[PDB]
Each structure stands twice: as C-alpha cells, then as structure tokens.
Design a protein around this ligand. Structure first.
Ligand SMILES: *[C@@H]1O[C@H](CO)[C@@H](O)[C@H](O)[C@H]1NC(C)=O
Ligand SMILES: *[C@@H]1O[C@H](CO)[C@@H](O)[C@H](O)[C@H]1NC(C)=O
Ligand SMILES: *[C@@H]1O[C@H](CO)[C@@H](O)[C@H](O)[C@H]1NC(C)=O
Lengths: 190, 208, 228
C-alpha cells in the first residue's frame, strides 16, 4: 500500500501568474487543500558526514511565499491565517519525506509552518532576530544499509504545498492550516 | 456562531399526517439528515440533499429552498416518532422531536411520605407523582408550612407512552431527618394545562 | 446488517485517561475514507469530536480543547480506529460513537452510513455502591379516584444502570419506571411506580424486583399499605 501524500510537492508544475488554491470543496475540512506556487522556492538537502543531514531553504523567500499564499486563502476566508505543524499522522504527512541521491530522508518542518498572518498583510507577531536561511534537521532510514563514504547532495524546487484546514468553532477568529493530507487520487485536472 | 438552526424543536402529529422538519443553514452546503432513537445510534436518512440512504422507505424526502433544507415524512407510521438531526459538514442541528398528538389530559397527582426505615438511616424523601398527562409541559412546586421550597427537588419524566400517548413525572424533595421533624404540613402544588386551577396534595407528619 | 464494532464502556476517575476502540471487516475498512468520532452528552445533541483518515492517519478536530486532549489513530492492518482521551472531566460524561465516511467527491457533504453501538463513558469520583430500596406505599392512604398508586424508591447507587420489574414480570401494565437522576453526592436515584385498582390490594401483592449488577445487589421488596 503506497501512500501518495506529502507536505511539500517538489519539481511539479507551476501556476502561470499567481498562486492557486485548489480543493474539491474548500468548505469541507476533510478535503485536501492543494497550493500551486507561481515562483518556486529552492530547497537544498545534503549529508556531510555520518549522522548529520539537514535541508536549507532561504528564510525570506519562504516567508514571502507563505504570505502570498495567505492572501489567496483570504479570498475564501477573509481573516488572519495561521500555519501550524500537524497534530498527528504518519511519516509522509508529518514530515518532509523525500529521496536524496538514493537515501530516504525525513526532516521535520516545524519552522516552515509556524506563523500568523494578521488581517492587514503585516503578519508575523515578532520582528525576527534571525537573519539566516532556514535549517531543517533530517534523519535517514536504515536499513542497516552499508555505510556511504560520499557527500550526499540533492537539489529540488518547491512547487506546491498540501494543507488541511482546522475545523470546529472555539478556534477563534482565525482559520488555521496544517500540512496534513489524504491520498491524492484525482488531482491533475485544470 | 451559528451555522445551523433546526426547527421546530417539538412537532406533534397523528400517524398518517405528514411531518416536515426544516434546517436553515448560514451557508449553502449539502444537508444530511439522521433519525435517532434512545439507546440506538443515529440512522442515516438522507444525504446530498435529496438522496435517500440505502434501505430507507420512500416516504422520507430531502428538499431544498435557498438556504432552507427540509426533511419531509409523508405518511407517518408509528416507528417514525423519534428525534431527527440535520448535519452540514462538521455541524449538527439541535434536533427536532416527533411526538404523538392527543387531547389534553390533566395529571392525576399522588404524594408519598418518606419510608419508615428510610427515616431510620437519617434521610427523608418525599415523592410526588404526576400521572398520565398530556401535553408534556407541567410544573411542580413544593411547599412546607406554606414556604415554597427550592434546591431540594429532583425531577424526572417518562417518555411518551406506547398506547395512551401520555407522560408521567416524578418529583423528589429530599431533606435531612432533623429538618423534616421541624415542620408539620408537606404539599406539592401542580400546575398543568388540563387543570383550570392549580392542584395540591398534602399530608402531615405522624398522621397516616 | 453491517456493524462497526466498538470497545466497551467504562467508569473513569476524573483526570484519568481513556481509550475507545472501533474495528471492522477488511472489506468495509477498505471502502472507508474517514472514521469520525461523535459524542452525545445525556439530554443533549450530537457533537462532532474529530476524524482520522484511514489511508494517511491524518486528523482534525471540532475544538481546540479536543485537539489538545484527544488523539485519533488507526491500524490499517487490524482495520481499527482508536480514540484516546486524557485529563477527563465531568464534561466528558457522554456516549461516544464511531462512524464511517465512504470515499466521496468534494461537495457531497458529510454522510455517515455505518455507526457503532456507542460506548458510554462515565466520569465520576464516587465509588461503586449498592442502592437502598424504600417502598412508597398506598399514599393517602387512598385514594385518587378509585385507583391507588404505589412503587419503590431506589436510592443512592452508583453507577448506572439498575433494572426494576414488577411481580417478576407479570405486571407490566400501569408501570412507570423513571429516568434516574444524579444527586449532588455523586449517586443516582430512581423511582418506579404503578397504578392499580384500589380494591385489588388485600387481594394481590405488589413486589418490586430491583437488580443492580455492578453491586451484585438484587432485592425483591414488598409494598403494602400503611400500618395505621
Ligand atoms: C527546479 O530547478 C531544478 C534545478 O536542478 C530543476 O532540476 C527542476 O527541473 C526545476 N523544477 C522544475 C519544475 O522543473
Ligand atoms: C553512523 O556511524 C557509524 C559509522 O561507522 C555507523 O556504523 C552507525 O550505524 C551510524 N549511526 C547511526 C545509524 O545512528
Ligand atoms: C534569503 O535570505 C538571505 C539572507 O542571507 C537574503 O540575503 C536573501 O535576500 C534571501 N533570498 C532572496 C534573495 O530571496
């Protein structure tokens, strides 16, 4: 049973002039929210030594991306939009789970999805102390596989994001979004 | 916020007559309907807005007008008298209850002084029985030496009877043994639609 | 017909935790996109708690409170959903249902065709205690219109339920066994009455049969008119 579901989509098609929010029904919190970016965010992952892997993404380009997404979401719910890490799930939707030069990487994305974009575009609550691009810690999956005496490097463009939106009521004035998902059969029409 | 408002809260019919519940949604969205009897899980009736669930009689029917979604039950059979719920995505309406319509019938009232041996333990319970009335709404006030009590009574009601379609009610005034002895006369005053003036049933301690 | 099979009822201490499980037949779990959990407090509506996807294990919740204290999981191998509640409170005393959503195209809404029998969870501090059974005898002492009312008051027992019958079952007509009520002590109480032709006493006996399996407490209690 192959689980086709993710947090980030890599190297896929791009929307032509602006970001696109797609869902079989946007009101249905149980149906997937697919984001198709218009300009991609580059992500470089690598393994220098044993027990050391991470991914890097430019912080500014990423955050500026998130904003442009939060504006498109606001076309459906005109309020403050929040991104947050998932409350549960399997590896495929709990982390960025990808193939890097053969190896199985899985990195947590807690710093990719931790922000609040308020009603005026002005967004994130605190003015940021950190100037450097974003570092996602990874781990590799065994499988007892013999050691690799190389430097592992892979280069992917982030194309889109897969989101589920919180449900219920006591949530406040905000619509919250997380990188969850269901399987993606029937996703390609336009 | 409210996304769903279900009405009426109680609807009284005779079998044969047709019932229509409605559910008014704040936003357009396909409405789902359930039947629900106590001690049983919900039964799926209608989905999309008009689609009929498998194995569900033809007399159930889902309609829509604007943001008003309704369920119609056209030739009421005895089993249909139950609570009904709408559901629009994660939200449920507050539910309509179908009840059987009969003529007004006033309650017969009975009062029961506490047990001989219950009194031994140190607690006293005075029970008051409102029997076989309709409609369901009924009010019971306790009075002791003619001082209208409060916070002492517990209250409980049967469901609508299989055959006469009435209701019964039990109200229980609970007092510590020493409190009980202080006062003489104990009464429960009952108000109902079927009573032109309120009814009282009394007794006093020692007297049988 | 087809069932969702639900794990058993419990009576839990405040603050403690609880797991409710739900499982089913492979053929059924395969046709299932989501398993929803819905609860119903007594004398209340249905409240939506949350969902888990069978394929990815993804979740969602109807309230921040729920999202914090409730965990939804599945084992695709055992065709089973689990709901875990932690830090219980009296506000959690309710009947919990698992319920199924077939794979559906967006815009159909939410429809749950299969449902479990439902699991009752009771959150209370009180210990298991057997009822005391006091008889409400022929009242004034009679009467209200050529007919007498008599019955048993089943007082101070925990937890639910108790069963009450009359004359070991032969008397079913004119019986009224009321909904239990929850006192401030933490204990329940219940009345059962019966109305009978007032000139039938002396000729017939009226015994209420009370059974409270949590206490292994069974009591037949005879009701007769006042001694006076
Ligand atoms: C993004 O750039 C990388 C550079 O190696 C390229 O391989 C990839 O094809 C680009 N993305 C798409 C959508 O083609
Ligand atoms: C990395 O360190 C050594 C290199 O010889 C290797 O044997 C070990 O399994 C690795 N550590 C892990 C997988 O945690
Ligand atoms: C990424 O952050 C770096 C900080 O070193 C900044 O110089 C750059 O403007 C950002 N990337 C761009 C140009 O989008």
């Amino acid at each position: 049973k192959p689980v086709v579901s993710t947090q980030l989509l890599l190297n896929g098609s791009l929307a032509e002039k602006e970001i696109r929010i797609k869902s079989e029904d946007i009101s249905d919190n149980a149906k997937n929210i697919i984001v198709q970016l218009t300009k991609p965010v580059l992500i470089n992952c690598a393994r220098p030594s044993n027990n050391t892997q991470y991914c890097v993404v430019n912080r500014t380009q990423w955050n500026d991306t998130l904003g442009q997404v939060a504006i498109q979401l606001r076309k459906h719910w005109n309020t403050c939009i929040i991104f947050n890490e998932p409350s549960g799930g399997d590896l495929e939707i709990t982390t960025h789970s990808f193939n890097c030069g053969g190896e199985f990487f899985y990195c947590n994305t807690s710093d990719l999805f931790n922000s609040t974009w308020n009603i005026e575009g002005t967004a994130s609550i605190d003015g940021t102390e950190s100037n450097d691009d974003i570092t996602l810690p990874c781990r590799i999956k065994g499988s007892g596989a013999p050691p690799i005496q190389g430097v592992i490097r892979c280069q992917s463009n982030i194309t889109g994001i897969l989101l589920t939106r919180d449900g219920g009521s006591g949530s406040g004035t905000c619509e919250t979004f997380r990188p969850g998902g269901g399987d993606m059969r029937d996703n390609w029409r336009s | 916020e409210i996304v769903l408002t279900q009405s009426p809260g109680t609807l009284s019919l005779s079998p044969g007559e047709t019932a229509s519940l409605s559910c008014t949604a704040a936003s357009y969205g396909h409405m789902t309907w359930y039947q629900k009897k106590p001690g049983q899980p919900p039964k799926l009736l209608i989905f999309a807005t008009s689609k009929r669930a498998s194995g569900i009689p033809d007399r159930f029917s889902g309609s829509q007008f604007g943001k008003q979604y309704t369920l119609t039950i056209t030739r009421m059979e005895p089993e249909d008298f139950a609570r009904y719920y709408c559901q629009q995505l994660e939200f449920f309406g507050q539910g309509t209850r179908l009840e059987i319509r009969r003529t007004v019938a006033a309650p017969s009232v009975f009062i029961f002084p506490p047990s001989d041996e219950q009194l031994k333990s140190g607690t006293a319970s005075v029970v008051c029985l409102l029997n076989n009335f309709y409609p369901r709404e009924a009010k019971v006030q306790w009075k002791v030496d003619n001082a209208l009590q409060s916070g002492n009574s517990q209250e409980s009601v049967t469901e609508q009877d299989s055959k006469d379609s009435t209701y019964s009610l039990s109200s229980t005034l609970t007092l510590s043994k020493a409190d009980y002895e202080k006062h003489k006369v104990y009464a429960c005053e009952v108000t109902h639609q079927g009573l032109s003036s309120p009814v009282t049933k009394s007794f006093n301690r020692g007297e049988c | 017909q087809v069932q969702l099979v639900q794990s058993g009822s419990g009576v839990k201490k405040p603050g403690a935790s609880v797991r409710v499980s739900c499982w089913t037949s492979e053929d059924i779990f395969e046709r299932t996109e989501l398993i929803h959990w819905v609860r119903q407090a007594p004398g209340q509506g249905l409240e939506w708690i949350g969902w888990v996807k069978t394929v990815t294990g993804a979740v969602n919740f109807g309230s921040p409170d729920f999202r914090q204290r409730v965990s939804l999981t599945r084992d695709r191998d055992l065709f089973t959903a689990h709901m875990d509640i932690r830090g219980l409170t009296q506000g959690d005393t309710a009947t919990y249902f698992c319920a199924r959503q077939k794979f559906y195209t967006g815009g159909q809404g939410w429809y749950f065709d299969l449902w479990g029998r439902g699991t009752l969870i009771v959150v209370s501090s009180a210990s298991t205690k057997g009822p005391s059974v006091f008889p409400l005898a022929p009242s004034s002492k009679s009467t209200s219109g050529g007919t007498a009312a008599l019955g048993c008051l089943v007082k101070d027992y925990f937890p639910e339920p108790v069963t009450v019958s009359w004359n070991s079952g032969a008397l079913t007509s004119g019986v009224h066994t009321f909904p239990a009520v929850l006192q401030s002590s933490g204990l329940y109480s219940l009345s059962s009455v019966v109305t009978v032709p007032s000139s039938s006493l002396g000729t017939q006996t009226y015994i209420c049969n009370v059974n409270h399996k949590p206490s292994n407490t069974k009591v037949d209690k005879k009701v007769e008119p006042k001694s006076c």
